[PDB]
């Protein structure tokens, strides 16, 4: 069928468009994930590189928050720079990509913004800790200033520890991240948007901490549901040796009292995604991109 970027629609709910995407590290896609039903030819870097850029070009985001970026310096930083994006990259200290014999270096988080829209006010590369234990996961938090209005806001991207058995570990990481954002936003004086692959479904403690934080954060993709009270049924969908995995791990959190969600990019239906799920010949990651338009209240 056609590329998913031709199937997904924006639900209507100087806007700022934020895109959240775990793009699937090249070294991990070929060497560790064991996508037993995705053809190997669809995982080639040249094919994936082109599909990732096409997704970004389709949605023309003002802010791009990425995880699992192992081709920052050779691909995404130079190419997106030519399109007007300023980039920041922060690698995991011990990336699993380094376990692959022909990898392209460590993966990590990246944060891109359109230079002609925003001025960079401050930036922090945060190594997440779990009750003071130094972990292998990271966050980037930047304060930006709108060059037209003068409004400042904070954008953060993170990637938490994966897999079952790390629920308490993820909760501690999230608490550290929230603690950092408390400091950077001066007690919610600055509006906040947090993008990440939290590697946790809404039933996990880490989700509840974000949902009950005094930062007053809402999850943007809940607004796709009828009453706006439920997270989407999935943000990642693939088939491993272990079995078919379909769950919600990706979120865009936002200051409920300071930002309004104007739109959200809808999900694929079961019929549209195809029997072989993601990734595929027409989509380069096992996670769907999340895209929302925000506006400042009043
Ligand atoms: N540098 C070196 O020399 C050595 C590296 N290692 C270590 O391996 C460790 C792994 O790194 P870490 O950051 O903790 O990675 P995580 O445990 O947090 O996640 C594993 C990565 O593969 C994806 N994934 C999800 N489910 C599975 C699965 N069932 N099987 C395989 N992959 C899956 C995940 O994506 P998603 O988020 O979407 O779920 C994720 O990106 C590192 O600490 C590294 O130091 C091991 C030996 C030597
Ligand atoms: Ca992955």
Residue numbers in the entry: 120 to 132, 141 to 425
Can you provide the manuscript's text about this entry?
A screen for circadian genes using Xenopus laevis retinas identified the ~50 kDa protein Nocturnin (NOCT), which exhibited a rhythmic expression that peaks at night (16 h Zeitgeber time, ZT16). NOCT is a member of the exonuclease/endonuclease/phosphatase family of proteins which include PDE12, a mitochondrial deadenylase needed for maturation of mitochondrial tRNAs, and CNOT6L, the mammalian ortholog of the main cytosolic yeast deadenylase CCR412,13. Thus, NOCT uses NADP+ and NADPH as substrates and removes the terminal 2′-phosphate.
To understand precisely how NOCT recognizes NADPH, we obtained co-crystals by using calcium instead of magnesium to inhibit the activity of WT NOCT and to stabilize the NOCT•NADPH complex. NOCT forms few contacts with the nucleobases. The adenine is sandwiched between two arginines (R290 and R367) via cation-pi interactions. In contrast, the ribose-5′-PP-5′-ribose-2′-P backbone of NADPH forms multiple stable contacts and has better electron density. In NOCT, the phosphate coordinates with the catalytic metal ion, which is positioned to stabilize the leaving group (ribose oxygen).
